[PDB]
């Protein structure tokens, strides 16, 4: 964190939304025989 | 005397271990072993370098995936030791190898050296108390129950039919080819590369083996399918990219029947059934066709048990009943066959002791080898 | 027998203090309980020192051969 | 000989610097060499011909200002000897260049003579105990403490994109384009020449940039304020003048974003970035779309996040989920990182000894450049 | 109708086209789209504004350079249409696309979307009569004169190895991997972006492709050079500046014989044809090892041939007789063999004719190719 250390330098941005991002959303069978007579 | 025994199925393609008597493998992993390609920069990386199982397949991407069995042989014996090492970790078994006794499955028709240098390795540098190599069809049909009947496996890098007769396993009728799973996915990553789209990454070649277990199906008219436009779906990549087949998903498996596409004079599945049949005691056919029990994981594909009954009916003489079976178990066939074997008592008189193997040697297994 | 010495880390008290509330009642400690302490660079700078000197500790056994 | 190493951030637009450990540089005075233009007659007037950060920012009008270093590249030797003379010196850290290891960081893909010359400075004119020179991305994973991310930095000459993958990097996949807040600035002093306002001086050139920092955003579509030619908002200069501007403070920084503006075909910054994902492993592309750290004092302009997140949307393959993290010490995120790592021991076996550049020279540097 | 045929030689760096019968390709020239950057101003300057041919190639700076076919895959089809029809101009054929059969080349193992839309577009908009598209190693061999041999060629885009034995092409002896001389141009302007001299422009790429052709050797011994220092040899440019390439001028194009250069898992020219040997039959690679054409563009570095038979030498198995022929203009092997075979009399059956297109489609191509 350090806020006052963020105090001192002048880039530090603050009120800007730190994380942009993008919207979110909510084997056979056997016996195959044949007989033949 | 042990503990007990371990069951470790070997796979060109996937491994599967657990002690005997369990009911399902409860370690299943691919057989391969993936080492990091690019640059360890950043301190606090992924440590070490060889990377086998769950972790091998979550970072899929650094690593460069190689397989040590090929056909069932085995090309590379130190990435071998690190996967049975693997299989002896703590992530796996937690157990130590000298306490336990193994039952290897193993391939037909495979050489001495197979057996000779894994049993070095097993007795030597694991030391375990007994080792016992084995067949796989034999252990498929002891998983099913039944005893008489051949076996048509194809799992990942062999396939072969061997006619079992109430526990002889006949030696003069196994027929063996070398087209398997893994050769399928690679005849079907050279035609998606036709197709447009480029896989040829060492770990890309196994999003092929994806697309090749959830795309593919096995058309029942070989040639009356190829003459027409299929559907074309797609397939999401792990990516998220779009991938539309198209006719390579059904001539991708057909391999298995015709390798002339790979260009081989080699013979289908069909011709492996009915050449394994034919190449035994005329008294046992009308046996040996009723009953026909499927394993290994090339089984798996869409269509496959129908059209195999409509090859060998066409292979097979006329009014004489055909019965293909095939169980929901064909990935874990041998090892439940392991499960069953080693779980008995006349296992104990059917192993190789250490001390026989420190006495005679390697001919000591190719004497007691079954 | 030799007998390689021992090191029982500290850890900040008023953390155990939160965490032992945590555990009169049916619930896993998080961050999230600090509420507004988290913020104290007083705070915050107390636990560096602290994790510095378990890196100490623990350097004292790592980096012992005979 | 060896206590708290210097971390120097040696960028082409402000040298940000100080001892490791620190949780914040000390000294971030901008990276120009101010000399006079005006002849001294009056006594006791200022002494010296070299003015270097608080000095050089206070008396600028009387100045000329000359970046040494351009594009991550150096130019003039002695202008960043004589800054990293200031840095060691009385005003800003009063130590003696022998007894602290030295961080130096640098752009990637800078050409091998930048390296050379850097360490000959580092071990001829001042006799640095321990050197190591880093890459401007591996720092800022450190200083957020992610080890997975796409470092997307915009530095005020070079930017560029290095994918990391749990620590390590996939250096095929760097792309860099030398198009960054130099250039912004510069094209804004041409577009205030086509408002009517110039500006020819050095000294006056850093108006420009404090017009570029305190009155330029990014709109989110490149035509819905291009044709509605909006308000002229005013600011004010430091005499007390003042400048309306309009079509600038958004038209000047497009120019990262398309550099076909500036008459140089390229990539813009959205495109670095997705190529460099693009570029890398097939399976580790969601993990890079969902990582994306920003860097560099370029990307504060206002709008700047939603920007570069539809262009990466319009890029990306649906439905992909796209996560930049943006952090608040984005000036200072590359230092921080700095002071991390060089407050690590494995730093210690990091670094490079004189008498290892002694016997060696520059191909110990070119060893240890990873 | 049945005149002169079309021989059109495809080429993914340079196209080459000619009647059949000529002993040499008369009309050759690169194969990209150039379209002007700047805007135009004066009236009455170059019209068209779609450069192609020597106009593109005098005034490179003026214009942007776009390729339309990337690794034998036309990437862009609107610029290949434009390019055939300026090779149907009054520049280079000065004839109608309708009186002559065309015979095109394409490299092996491409996507059958390619040759679908080259027929489509020969057929459509070029109203061709007869289309027979084929390969290039067979032509090599007409070109030649001989039937048996390996062909191995490095392309522009393509560097692959087809084996023919007395006029029997085997397929799936066939080995092809898009590691070829546009990447060795691109991974030289990497080096050069390493060593200072950025070359980033499209028209500027053109540069370092003059530079690759002109500048750079195969060392026989790679790591031995690779790992040593260089002499630092002087280049002029067309600026009439001077460059000091150095040891980059080698380390260049070994990615040809190891692509792990730019990262890429796949194998070198040697292990190509190596393994593109090996996949044949047992009784057939003594005459394939004592019979190897060389043929493509990439196959002219100096100090190339040494390599090969270097490597093929520590490939092969001992005491196995290894010979390299290759023909003196390499550049216009595969063009004058497709003169030769478009000259003869069973070229008549060998096409397929404008009717045959209406009556199947692509189905007939498909068929005919092969
Ligand atoms: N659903 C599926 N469809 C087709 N092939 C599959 C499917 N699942 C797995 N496979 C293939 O089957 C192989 C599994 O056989 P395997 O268990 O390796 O036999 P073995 O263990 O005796 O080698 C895998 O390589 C995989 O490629
Ligand atoms: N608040 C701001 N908004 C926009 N741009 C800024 C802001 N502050 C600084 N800049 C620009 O970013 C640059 C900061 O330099 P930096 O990104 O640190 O370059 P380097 O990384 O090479 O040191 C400044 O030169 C200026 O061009
Ligand atoms: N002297 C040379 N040294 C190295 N490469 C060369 C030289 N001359 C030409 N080339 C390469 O030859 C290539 C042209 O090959 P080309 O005949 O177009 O193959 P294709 O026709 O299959 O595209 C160019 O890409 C160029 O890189």
Redesign the interface.
């Known amino acids: 964190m350090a806020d006052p250390k963020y105090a001192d330098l002048p880039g530090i941005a603050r009120n800007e939304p730190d994380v942009y991002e993008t919207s979110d959303l909510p084997?056979?069978?056997?016996?195959?025989?044949?007989?033949?007579? | 005397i042990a503990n007990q025994p371990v069951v470790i199925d070997n796979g060109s393609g996937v491994i599967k271990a657990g002690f005997a008597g369990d009911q399902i493998p409860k370690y299943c992993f691919p057989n391969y072993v993936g080492r990091?390609?690019?640059?360890?920069?950043?301190?606090?990386?992924?440590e070490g370098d060889i990377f086998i199982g769950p972790k091998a397949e979550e970072?899929?991407?650094?690593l460069?995936i190689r397989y040590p069995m090929e056909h069932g042989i085995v090309k590379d014996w130190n990435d071998m030791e690190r996967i049975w090492q693997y299989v002896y970790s703590k992530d796996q078994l937690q157990t130590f190898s000298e306490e336990h006794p193994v039952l290897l499955t193993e391939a037909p028709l495979n050489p001495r050296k197979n057996r000779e240098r894994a049993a070095e390795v097993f007795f030597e540098t694991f030391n375990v108390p007994a080792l016992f190599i084995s067949m796989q069809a034999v252990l498929s049909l002891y998983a099913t129950g039944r005893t008489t009947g051949v076996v048509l496996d194809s799992g990942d890098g062999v396939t072969h039919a061997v006619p079992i007769y109430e526990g002889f396993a006949m030696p003069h009728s196994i027929m063996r080819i070398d087209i398997a799973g893994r050769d399928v996915s690679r005849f079907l990553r050279?035609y998606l590369?036709?197709?447009?789209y480029?896989?040829?990454?060492?770990?890309?070649f196994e999003?092929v083996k994806a697309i090749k277990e959830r795309a593919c199906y096995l058309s029942i008219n070989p040639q009356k399918d190829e003459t027409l436009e299929t559907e074309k779906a797609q397939y999401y990549?792990?990516?998220?990219?779009?991938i539309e087949i198209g006719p390579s998903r059904f001539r991708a498996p057909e391999l298995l029947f015709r390798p002339d596409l790979?260009?081989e004079e080699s013979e289908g599945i069909h011709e492996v059934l009915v050449f394994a049949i034919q190449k035994s005691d005329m008294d046992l056919r009308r046996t040996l066709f009723s009953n026909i029990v499927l394993s290994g994981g090339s089984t798996?594909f869409?269509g496959?048990?129908?059209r195999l009954?409509s090859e060998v009916?066409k292979l097979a003489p006329?009014?004489?009943?055909?019965?293909?079976?095939?169980?929901?178990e064909r990935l874990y066939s041998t090892w439940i066959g392991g499960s069953i074997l080693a779980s008995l008592d006349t296992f104990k008189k059917m192993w190789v002791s250490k001390k026989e193997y420190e006495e005679d040697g390697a001919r000591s297994i190719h004497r007691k080898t079954f | 027998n030799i007998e390689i010495p021992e090191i029982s880390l500290p850890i900040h008290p008023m953390i155990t203090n939160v965490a032992k509330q945590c555990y009169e009642r049916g619930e896993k400690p998080k961050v999230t309980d600090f509420g507004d302490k988290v913020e104290d660079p007083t705070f915050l700078n107390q636990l560096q020192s602290g994790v510095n000197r378990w890196i100490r500790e623990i350097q004292k056994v790592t980096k012992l051969d005979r």
């Open positions: 084997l056979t069978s056997t016996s195959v025989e044949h007989i033949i007579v | 990091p390609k690019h640059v360890r920069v950043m301190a606090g990386a992924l970072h899929r991407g650094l460069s050279l590369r036709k197709e447009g480029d896989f040829h990454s060492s770990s890309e999003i990549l792990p990516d998220g990219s779009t790979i260009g798996l869409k496959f048990g129908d009954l009916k006329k009014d004489v009943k055909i019965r293909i079976s095939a169980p929901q």
